[PDB]
Short mmCIF file of C-alpha atoms in Angstrom, two decimals:
data_model
loop_
_atom_site.label_atom_id
_atom_site.label_comp_id
_atom_site.label_asym_id
_atom_site.label_seq_id
_atom_site.Cartn_x
_atom_site.Cartn_y
_atom_site.Cartn_z
CA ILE A 1 -5.49 29.55 18.35
CA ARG A 2 -2.61 27.18 17.71
CA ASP A 3 -4.14 24.21 15.90
CA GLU A 4 -0.88 22.76 14.61
CA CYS A 5 -2.32 19.25 14.72
CA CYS A 6 -4.92 20.38 12.18
CA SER A 7 -2.25 19.95 9.50
CA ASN A 8 -1.88 16.37 10.72
CA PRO A 9 -4.38 13.73 9.57
CA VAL A 10 -3.42 11.67 12.61
CA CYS A 11 -4.42 14.39 15.03
CA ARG A 12 -7.63 15.45 13.32
CA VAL A 13 -8.76 11.87 12.96
CA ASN A 14 -8.76 11.31 16.73
CA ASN A 15 -9.74 14.83 17.76
CA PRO A 16 -13.41 15.79 17.31
CA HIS A 17 -12.91 19.33 16.00
CA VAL A 18 -9.53 20.67 17.13
CA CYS A 19 -9.13 23.04 14.20
#
């Protein structure tokens, strides 16, 4: 529980469901 990259469209675009 630390999905900081969720608030980043660059992270969530490459990650499958990290949020």
